[PDB]
Design a protein around this ligand. Structure first.
Ligand SMILES: [Cl-]
Ligand SMILES: [Mg+2]
Lengths: 243, 250, 167, 231, 240, 235, 195, 241, 244
């Protein structure tokens, strides 16, 4: 034993226990989801209201990369911010050299390689976040989810955090009941519902809903936050479904 | 990041032993048998092509390697370590010698350079020793034919004949009885094949044995004509057919 | 040539002309023409037969016939007059040496003898040092061998070239 | 236990103990309170002395004309982080002729603290900060933790016995937020809030430290007889 | 580069590596320094376990740093060469920039500063050496004698000893050395230095080295016979 | 083993806390600030009678208006003093003025936590930095290896610190004269010292606006010791 | 032109160096000693660009004195001259070369022979019976070609040197304000106070 | 027992971190197979999409390194992509420096040397992957070269990698014992892919749908992967005889 | 991080010893014995090769005696590979001195330089020390014939006669017994071989198990010659002295 004391050490299983311990930090975090729709993607996240003293709508969790990519994550919030800062540098250098905005699969690997690099040495710690991200590019809509190991895949729907099992079950129903696809405005409504349903795992403290989206028709392929009437419409739809 | 292993991973123990070097020698002991014999007019080096799978093409894996036109090398121990050493050995023969003096280094000095590289892996920061022992056969104008052994420590010794790896203890005894100072090259090849048969279990033929010589100059292998002083490489790898011909007269 | 040999050993393949071409031009380009090397590179490899020229600034050119140096104009005049497609080995050697002769006779920077190298496919390359020798010095009218003792000397001494001796 | 030797090591439950131990240093530190209205933002800090001959350790640091913070924990670490903020506020002014946003100031602190939690050799910061400021979107109050977590709040408190002041502010939320165009009453609410965290000792003239920033009010610190008014 | 912190504090507030360096000094051969009214004498022990030695070429224990200052030591011999070299370089550097040779106090402060630096620098261990630095300042007739140690602290001494069994010879010097009236002559000073070593040395043959330093760059090392005469006179007076 | 910049479960840096233990083993140093000046006094503590005590330099000048006393691993203080002197002189070069005592102290304390795996460990010495400037007048600071500095009306550091600090608690008042402070340092030093206090094993110093920083002669201190003995015998 | 001369006789080396220091239109000093003692039996005179001359001489002096202390031994004049040459040969391909010419006069105690070395700023070393740097050689070399012997005494060497200085004072355009003369022999280095 | 944490020798002369990297290779529970035709080299690999929420098009362990070279990986995807990106960079650099396309065997050697360095240098860990490179080389013809965490590499007539590699290996061994040749004597690559799939079915004892497999094909001057519909056409032909 | 695996090669024990230096000396104590004897008219270097084989090519072999320059040579005891690193450094140092001062390097200066390099590995860098002990045999015009030894600690000392490697305790006692100051080279040759013959762990001392060298002024007039003995020449001197 002692194989779990240092990062980048293979155990006799062939496992990196330090990365597996980073996953525990992710599982401890709040719920966040992603939904791939007809011509874009929708992101949503659970924000726990620790106290009345928290200013509503101010502590924003979802982050934009470039102008067409959205990023949300569960786990250690600072680690997620560090990853997004890197993502922004990666996207900037891509656009600098190649002119076109970075494609989503291309962007996904840039994060993947960077996270994977933090499993190669004992002088660094793995990332304590699973990141759900995506957007619209020349080839259409893309949704991805990236783990502490550096592992990522494309997704129809994605979920992580403390209420991931509840969310995953809800996402699986949508995939089955909508083979032809889901619209952007529908996805926002469904996203709200799923976060509310996933909140049963964090039911002690009340929460604040935060949604964003990229859509070719609704947002011209740019990342925007869901605000005002459209946000309230999604909250009402979500509240109606739980009752 | 940064390589933060700037300290030695090989250190003296209370008994005065250098553990990592001893353990590297143990890895060499497990390795497949290889040998070298020196004749009056040449040198022979040989080893078994231990194929990991019958689907694998064992011709693509070269255990016996040309370092210079007149110097060859064979090993016992960890194959990957050997492969990188051959790369470095080839390069150092150019950078530290040929690009300075306009000619290939003599056997002993190339061996000295390889030995240096292996010593540094025994003392430098954040590295383990090489897990191989090399046998380097070669020829040069002023020293003639020569055969050297190089160990993980960086120590090297000249030999009339020797063996390393799996069945080296038995093979060295076999060579002591057969070796004399009047051997011709063909006689040394014959003795090499006899010695190597003892350590091999399965098939024993040109396809499972790798054998090369340092002998006469080969103008046919030079690739060009017109310069009298350039007479061709003394290193030659024996073909599968050439080995089988000598196995009939065995 | 050194790096090509090491490359050939690494790859277990015979070297290609385009590899030497690429390595040369990238080296020369890096030094911005300060390495004054103007080369004609030729050879045969598994891909076929090749002929290139290299300028000191790093530009390369492809051709069936090329000439470089101070006598390149004298040589190219011959090549442009006598070159044709589908030349034989014997016709090409003649054309090449004729082109060099044009330079030897007409260019002051060129002279003496003609060296040749033939690189044919599926064969060893033959280097023909002093293929032609049309400029041998005529016999001198007189011998200038001096009478021994003609030169005035002040001192003599043996020089010790040997190492330090035993005993 | 076995996973608290350095900051580069997760525990089996996904915890970073060196960060948690750094968080502990804040709890040992003296209490400090932060609160704001729509027009002004106030910092109130209980200063601590070594003994009767000693001075009372300063808790509040000015970062710019429109921004500053109060500290709780390792004071030298607060000096490093406040110096960084001073430079960042200054870079924004010199290059962009732009006063640094309080939210963006929080983001910069978060990212600086984070690098110290993921790399070998270094250590987390051992201090918690309460940043107040007035920018183009009005008054702001931030809470910085050396884990990297930064939070925008109406009011808060950090340090020893800070739970008492935090509960008071949670009750008074609706009242003190409405205190617009009245600095003295907003400070009164802050002084009354920090009083809920006191035991044995009371607020004296060289014990109390107050700072304020607002609409037409540069970041200024009040100490000595300047705070006798509020005792 | 190798950056590892080798010299560090322990729970009881000790730097063990610095303290273990003092144990290396305790193992080293005894060295003694005594200053008279117009001179300083440096005595040194030579362990007689090593015979068949070539005393012409063997590194002498007392080293000249400049023409007016000398340095002896106790502890690791290899370590002492590094300090001596640095000290010699600084002595010439001082002459070059200040146009005046170093004071004995300055040279001591430099050597002590080097020793200190090695107690809080990454990747290095402390020097296992304590030194006795003696001499006369330029254009000054007041004798100077300083001591340094691995930690980096230094101080001036009327008389001092370092090395193995230094506790015994310090005991001797504390009762025999009078501050109000120090050794007035060279003879008296050398005699007291030899006497102090004879408490520890064993045989008074080739085991005692003596070096006398006088004002105005007047440094001389005594021979075997010259020292043997002191050894003879001391014991003949003792037989009473 | 373990990191040099490691936090304990209580939220303290191991190495900093251990360096504080080394300072407790050091010789006593006392500082007293008054409206007529600041007095600094130290215990020399010679290890042997053959050691020439006047070479023991535990009180040190930083500038004409700033002095400094030390306690602990005194060898570590040399680089701190060198930095302080450079900072003081450099500021005068850049600004044509004396540097504030607090600003000088802050500059010294910035070195404190520059250790890791920069220097390999914290300083094992505490400093009493005393001085005067036009803005804040006569001041006394206590600079630790934690990087923290407190201002003090009076302060004792070293082996007899907590016993001396309790004595300074009672004796100090805001109307102390310089002469009264001098005797008070001598009184408390004599109380906590192992060996009997005299002019050779103890040293006094002061900083005034007029004369600047001055280390006292052994003849001058001897008279103050004699003056102390008589006034204690007076009641 | 900073006149520096050197003559090697039977049992000693004699160096003569001008006393004037002229900066522009004014003679700032008329008693300047353009030499440094490298070791008890080795003396180096120098001439070249302002500042560089002294900086170089003192740098060499420091290095030789360091060697003497380390080894408790005096380097031979030949060894010192080779060290000096290498420093100048290193210097000439530097960013800013030392613009200094030197003469090294020494007495080798091992061989019991005087030795004179002439080294220019490029690092060009030659051992000579007599030498000079700058324009002085244009007058003195031919004069010494006529009057020199290897078996001359020190007194004859000084008379021969007076003849050089008289010629320089007659035919050179600058007033170099006379010379400081120093003798290097078995007993060490001494200055001739009346010349 | 720190000789099991970093890449230094144990008393037995073993590198335990290298051995444990070999075990990580099978973590994905996927089996791959590679065979050579006359004009082509075919590589097939099992495809497993357990989650319904996954976009199955993005789930892949086959990589297009260069126009001519393809690579299948056995091991975790992060290490797989790490190796893929490096191989792509190396292949591109090679073409720029030496003026011709990097051969399959040379790339394999280069990646093997990089792997060797991780077994010797302490600060770098081995990658828990086995890399199988395939191409139709312009000199050597159809080529299969495989690299592992030890830094070992060799050419192959055919090969298999994964948990059930031995079953596939013996199945292939027995076929080449009958035919007595070093390749699949077949003109079209379509039939070579059919051979590969057929012999994997026989060895593993499992039937495959179009979404259960992943196929890569190397021909002269290009390497390409088959779509689900291209594989379906392949499965239909197998069933009809 | 990496700290976990650091052996800390450059630290003191509680007793004030350098662990790695002490263990390196333990390694050297198993190495073949090497002896140096200094006489009035020259120096002898004798050394024993370790358990050789009949198939070892002796005439082209060199594991013990190495040439640093024309005036100085060394006998090695310990790791040969480590020794060659230092030997090549020493060879360069001698040439640097010659280029600078145009004189051959004094023996002590060369010895001090190598000894300072060894010292460095014990004080800083975190690397293991060189497991090598040298016997330096050399000549210069200042001190004449000189014998020195250096060990992994970087400490060096001068000697009239000295041994390193295996059985030095026994070897030093025998040398101390029969050595005299007015001794000559031919007598020193005999002493060196007789000492090895008694201290050897082998059954008998033969030519194939020895390396031998002399530094003599026995060169034509005032100059010094180095003689590295050939196998046949070692065989002859063994018969002459009456050992075989
Ligand atoms: Cl490579
Ligand atoms: Mg010249």
């Amino acid at each position: 034993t002692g194989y779990d004391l240092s990062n980048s050490v293979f155990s006799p299983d062939g496992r990196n226990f330090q990365v597996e311990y980073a996953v525990k930090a992710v599982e401890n975090g709040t719920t966040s989801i992603g939904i791939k729709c007809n011509d874009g993607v929708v992101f949503a996240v659970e924000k726990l209201i620790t106290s009345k003293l928290l200013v509503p709508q101010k502590n924003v969790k979802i982050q934009v990369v470039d102008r067409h990519i959205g990023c949300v994550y569960s786990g250690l919030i600072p680690d997620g911010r560090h990853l997004v800062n890197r993502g922004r540098e990666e996207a900037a250098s891509f656009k600098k050299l190649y002119k076109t905005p970075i494609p989503i699969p291309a962007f996904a690997d840039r994060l993947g390689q960077y996270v994977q690099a933090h499993t190669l040495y004992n002088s660094v710690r793995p990332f304590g976040v699973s990141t759900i991200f995506g957007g619209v590019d020349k080839n259409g809509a893309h949704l991805y989810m990236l783990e502490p190991s550096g592992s990522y895949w494309g997704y129809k729907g994605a979920a992580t955090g403390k209420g991931r099992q509840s969310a995953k079950a809800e996402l699986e129903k949508l995939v089955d009941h909508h083979p032809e696809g889901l619209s952007a405005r529908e996805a926002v409504k469904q996203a709200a519902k799923i976060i509310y349903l996933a909140h049963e795992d964090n039911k002690e403290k009340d929460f604040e809903l935060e949604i964003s989206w990229c859509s070719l028709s609704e947002t011209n392929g740019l990342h925007k936050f869901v605000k005002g009437d459209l946000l309230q419409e999604a909250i009402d739809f979500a509240q109606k479904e739980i009752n | 990041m940064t390589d933060r292993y700037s300290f030695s991973l090989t250190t003296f123990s209370p008994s005065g032993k250098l553990g990592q070097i001893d353990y590297a020698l143990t890895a060499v002991k497990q390795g497949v048998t290889s040998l070298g014999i020196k004749a009056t007019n040449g040198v022979v080096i040989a080893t078994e092509k231990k194929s990991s799978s019958p689907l694998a093409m064992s011709e693509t894996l070269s255990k016996v390697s040309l370092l210079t036109p007149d110097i060859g090398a064979v090993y016992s121990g960890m194959g990957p370590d050997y492969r990188v050493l051959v790369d470095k050995s080839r390069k150092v023969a150019h950078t530290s010698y040929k690009r300075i003096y306009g000619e290939y280094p003599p056997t002993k000095l190339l061996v000295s350079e390889v030995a240096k590289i292996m010593q540094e892996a025994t003392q430098s920061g954040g590295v383990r020793p090489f897990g191989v022992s090399l046998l380097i056969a070669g020829h040069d104008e002023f020293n003639g034919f020569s055969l050297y052994q190089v160990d993980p420590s960086g120590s090297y010794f000249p030999w009339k004949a020797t063996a390393i790896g799996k069945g080296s203890v038995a093979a060295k005894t076999f060579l002591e009885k057969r070796w004399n100072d009047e051997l011709e090259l063909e006689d040394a090849i014959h003795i090499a094949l006899l010695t190597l048969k003892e350590s091999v279990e399965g098939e024993f033929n040109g396809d499972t044995i790798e054998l090369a010589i340092i002998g006469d100059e080969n103008p046919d292998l030079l690739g060009y004509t017109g310069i009298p002083t350039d007479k061709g490489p003394r290193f030659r790898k024996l073909t599968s057919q050439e080995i089988n011909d000598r196995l009939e007269a065995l | 040539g050194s790096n090509i040999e090491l490359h050939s050993l690494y790859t277990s393949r015979e070297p290609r002309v385009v590899s030497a071409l690429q390595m040369l031009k990238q080296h020369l380009f890096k030094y911005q023409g300060h390495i004054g090397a103007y080369l004609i590179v030729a050879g045969v490899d598994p891909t076929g037969s090749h002929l290139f020229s290299i300028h000191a600034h790093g530009s390369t050119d492809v051709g069936y016939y090329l000439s470089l140096g101070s006598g390149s104009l004298a040589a190219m005049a011959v090549l442009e007059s006598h070159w044709k497609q589908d030349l034989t080995k014997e016709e090409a050697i003649k054309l090449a040496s004729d082109a060099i002769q044009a330079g030897i006779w007409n260019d002051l920077g060129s002279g003496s003898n003609v060296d040749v190298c033939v690189m044919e496919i599926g064969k060893d390359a033959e280097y023909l040092r002093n293929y032609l020798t049309p400029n041998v010095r005529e016999e001198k009218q007189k011998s200038y061998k001096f009478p021994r003792g003609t030169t005035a000397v002040l001192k003599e001494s043996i020089v010790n070239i040997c190492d330090i001796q035993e005993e | 236990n076995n996973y608290d030797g350095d900051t580069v090591t997760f525990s089996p439950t996904g915890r970073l103990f060196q960060v948690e131990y750094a968080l502990e240093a804040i709890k040992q530190g003296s209490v400090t309170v932060g609160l704001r209205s729509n027009t002004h933002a106030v910092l109130v800090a209980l200063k601590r002395n070594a003994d009767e001959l000693s001075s009372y350790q300063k808790k509040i640091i000015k970062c710019d004309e429109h921004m500053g913070l109060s500290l709780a924990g390792l004071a030298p670490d607060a000096r490093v982080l406040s110096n960084y903020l001073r430079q960042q506020c200054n870079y924004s002014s010199l290059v962009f002729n732009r006063k640094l946003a309080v939210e963006r100031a929080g983001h910069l602190l978060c990212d600086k603290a984070q690098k110290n939690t993921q790399s070998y050799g270094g250590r987390p910061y051992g201090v918690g900060l309460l940043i107040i400021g007035y920018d183009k979107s009005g008054a702001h109050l931030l809470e910085f933790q050396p884990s990297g977590n930064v939070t925008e709040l109406y009011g808060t408190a950090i340090g020893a016995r800070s739970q008492g002041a935090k509960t008071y502010l949670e009750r008074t939320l609706d009242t003190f937020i409405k205190i617009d165009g009245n600095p003295d009453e907003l400070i009164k609410a802050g002084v009354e809030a920090i009083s809920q965290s006191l035991r044995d000792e009371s607020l004296t003239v060289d014990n109390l430290s107050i700072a304020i920033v607002g609409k037409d009010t540069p970041f200024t610190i009040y100490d000595g007889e300047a705070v006798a008014k509020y005792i | 580069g190798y950056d590892r912190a080798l010299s560090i504090f322990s729970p009881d507030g000790h730097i063990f590596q610095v303290e273990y360096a003092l144990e290396a000094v305790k193992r080293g051969t005894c060295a003694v320094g005594v200053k008279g009214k117009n001179c300083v004498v440096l005595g040194c022990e030579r362990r007689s376990t090593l015979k068949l030695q070539d005393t012409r070429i063997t590194p002498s224990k007392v080293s000249k740093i400049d023409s007016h200052v000398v340095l002896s030591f106790s502890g690791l011999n290899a370590d002492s060469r590094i300090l001596i070299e640095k000290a010699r370089v600084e002595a010439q550097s001082h002459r070059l920039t200040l146009e005046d040779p170093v004071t004995v106090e300055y040279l001591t402060r430099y050597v002590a500063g080097v020793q200190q630096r090695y107690t809080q620098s990454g990747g290095v261990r402390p020097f296992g050496v304590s030194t006795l630095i003696a001499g006369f300042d330029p254009r000054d007739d007041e004798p100077k004698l300083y001591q340094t140690e691995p930690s980096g602290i230094y101080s001036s001494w009327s008389a001092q000893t370092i090395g193995r069994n230094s506790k015994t010879v310090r005991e001797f010097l504390e009762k025999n050395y009078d501050r109000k009236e120090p050794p007035a002559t060279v003879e008296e000073c050398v005699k007291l230095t030899v006497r102090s070593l004879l408490e520890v040395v064993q045989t008074g043959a080739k085991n005692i080295e003596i070096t006398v330093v006088k004002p105005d760059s007047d440094i001389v090392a005594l021979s075997s016979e010259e020292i043997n005469q002191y050894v003879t006179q001391i014991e003949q007076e003792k037989q009473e | 083993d373990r990191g040099v910049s490691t936090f304990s479960p209580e939220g303290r840096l191991f190495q900093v806390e251990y360096s504080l233990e080394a300072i407790k083993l050091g010789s006593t140093a006392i500082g007293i600030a008054t409206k007529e000046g600041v007095v600094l006094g130290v215990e020399k503590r010679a290890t042997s009678p053959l050691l020439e005590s006047d070479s023991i330099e535990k009180i040190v000048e930083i500038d004409r208006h700033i002095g400094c006393a030390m306690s602990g691993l005194t060898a570590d203080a040399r680089s701190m003093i060198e930095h302080a002197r450079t900072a003081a002189v450099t500021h005068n070069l850049y600004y044509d003025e004396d540097i504030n005592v607090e600003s000088l102290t802050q500059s010294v304390c910035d070195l404190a936590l520059r250790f890791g795996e920069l220097m390999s460990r914290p300083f094992g010495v505490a400093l009493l930095i005393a001085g005067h400037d036009a803005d804040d007048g006569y001041q006394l600071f206590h600079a630790e290896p934690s990087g923290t500095f407190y201002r003090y009306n009076a302060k004792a550091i070293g082996s007899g610190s907590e016993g001396a600090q309790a004595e300074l608690l009672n004796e100090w008042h805001s109307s102390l004269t310089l002469k009264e402070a001098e005797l008070l340092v001598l009184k408390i030093l004599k109380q906590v010292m192992e060996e009997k206090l005299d002019e050779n094993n103890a040293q006094l110093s002061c900083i005034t606006k007029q004369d600047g920083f001055k280390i006292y002669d052994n003849e001058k201190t001897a008279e103050l010791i004699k003056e102390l003995k008589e006034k204690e015998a007076a009641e | 032109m900073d006149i520096i001369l050197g003559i090697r006789v039977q049992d000693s080396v004699i160096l003569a160096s001008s006393k004037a220091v002229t900066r522009g239109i004014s003679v700032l000093k008329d008693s300047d000693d353009k030499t440094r003692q490298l070791s008890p039996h080795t003396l180096m005179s120098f001439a070249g660009e302002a500042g560089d001359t002294v900086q170089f001489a003192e740098y060499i002096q420091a290095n030789i004195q360091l060697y003497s202390i380390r080894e408790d031994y005096e380097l031979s004049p030949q060894a010192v001259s080779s060290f000096v040459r290498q420093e100048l040969a290193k210097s000439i391909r530097s960013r800013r070369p030392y613009q200094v010419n030197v003469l090294i006069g020494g007495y080798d105690k091992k061989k019991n022979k005087p030795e004179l070395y002439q080294i220019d700023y490029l690092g060009t070393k030659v051992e000579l019976p007599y030498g000079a740097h700058g324009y002085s050689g244009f007058y003195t070399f031919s004069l010494l070609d006529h009057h020199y012997r290897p078996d001359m005494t020190t007194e004859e060497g000084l008379d021969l040197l007076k003849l050089c200085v008289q010629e320089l004072e007659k035919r050179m355009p600058m007033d170099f304000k006379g010379v400081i003369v120093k003798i290097v022999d078995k007993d060490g280095i001494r200055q001739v106070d009346d010349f | 027992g720190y000789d099991r944490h970093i890449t230094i020798f144990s008393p037995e002369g073993r590198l335990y971190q290298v051995e444990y990297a070999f075990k990580a290779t099978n973590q994905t529970n996927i089996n791959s197979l590679a065979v050579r035709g006359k004009d082509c080299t075919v590589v097939i690999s099992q495809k497993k999409v357990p989650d319904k929420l996954l976009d199955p098009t993005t789930v892949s362990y086959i990589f297009c390194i260069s126009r001519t070279i393809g690579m299948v990986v056995n091991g975790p995807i992060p290490d797989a992509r790490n190796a893929a990106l490096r191989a792509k960079a190396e292949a591109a650099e090679f073409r720029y420096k030496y003026g011709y396309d990097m051969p399959c065997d040379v790339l394999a050697k280069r990646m093997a040397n990089l792997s060797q360095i991780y077994t010797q240098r302490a600060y770098m860990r081995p990658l828990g992957v086995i890399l199988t490179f395939v191409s139709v080389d312009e000199e050597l013809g159809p080529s299969i070269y495989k690299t592992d965490p030890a830094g070992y590499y060799v050419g192959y007539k055919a090969t298999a990698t994964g948990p059930k590699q031995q079953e596939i290996t013996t199945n292939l061994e027995n076929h080449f014992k009958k035919s007595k040749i070093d390749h699949i004597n077949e003109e079209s690559w379509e039939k070579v892919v059919e051979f590969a799939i057929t012999h994997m079915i026989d060895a593993l004892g499992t039937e495959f749908s179009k979404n259960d497999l992943e196929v890569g094909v190397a021909t002269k001057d290009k390497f390409f992967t088959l779509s689900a519909e291209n594989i379906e056409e392949r499965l239909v032909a197998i069933a009809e005889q | 991080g990496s700290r976990r695996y650091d052996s800390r090669t450059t630290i003191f024990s509680p007793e004030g010893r350098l662990y790695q230096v002490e263990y390196a000396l333990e390694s050297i104590s198993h190495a073949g014995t090497a002896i140096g004897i200094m006489a009035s008219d020259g120096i002898v270097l004798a050394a024993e090769r370790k358990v050789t084989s009949t198939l070892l090519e002796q005439d082209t072999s060199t594991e013990k005696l190495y040439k640093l320059n024309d005036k100085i040579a060394v006998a090695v005891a310990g790791l040969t590979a480590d020794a060659e690193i230092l030997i090549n450094t020493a060879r360069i140092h001698a040439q640097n001195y010659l280029k600078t001062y145009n004189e051959d390097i004094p023996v002590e200066i060369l010895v001090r330089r190598l000894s300072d390099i060894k010292q460095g590995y014990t004080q800083h860098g975190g690397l293991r020390p060189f497991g090598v002990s040298f016997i330096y045999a050399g000549y210069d015009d200042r001190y004449g014939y000189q014998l020195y030894t250096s060990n992994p600690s970087g400490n060096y000392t001068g000697w009239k006669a000295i041994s390193v490697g295996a059985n030095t305790s026994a070897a030093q006692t025998l040398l101390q017994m029969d050595y005299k100051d007015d001794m000559k080279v031919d007598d020193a040759i005999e002493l060196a071989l007789k000492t090895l013959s008694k201290t050897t762990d082998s059954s008998a001392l033969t030519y194939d198990r020895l390396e031998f060298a002399t530094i003599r002024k026995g060169a034509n007039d005032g100059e010094v010659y180095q003689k590295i003995f050939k196998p046949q020449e070692i065989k002859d001197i063994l018969v002459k002295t009456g050992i075989t």
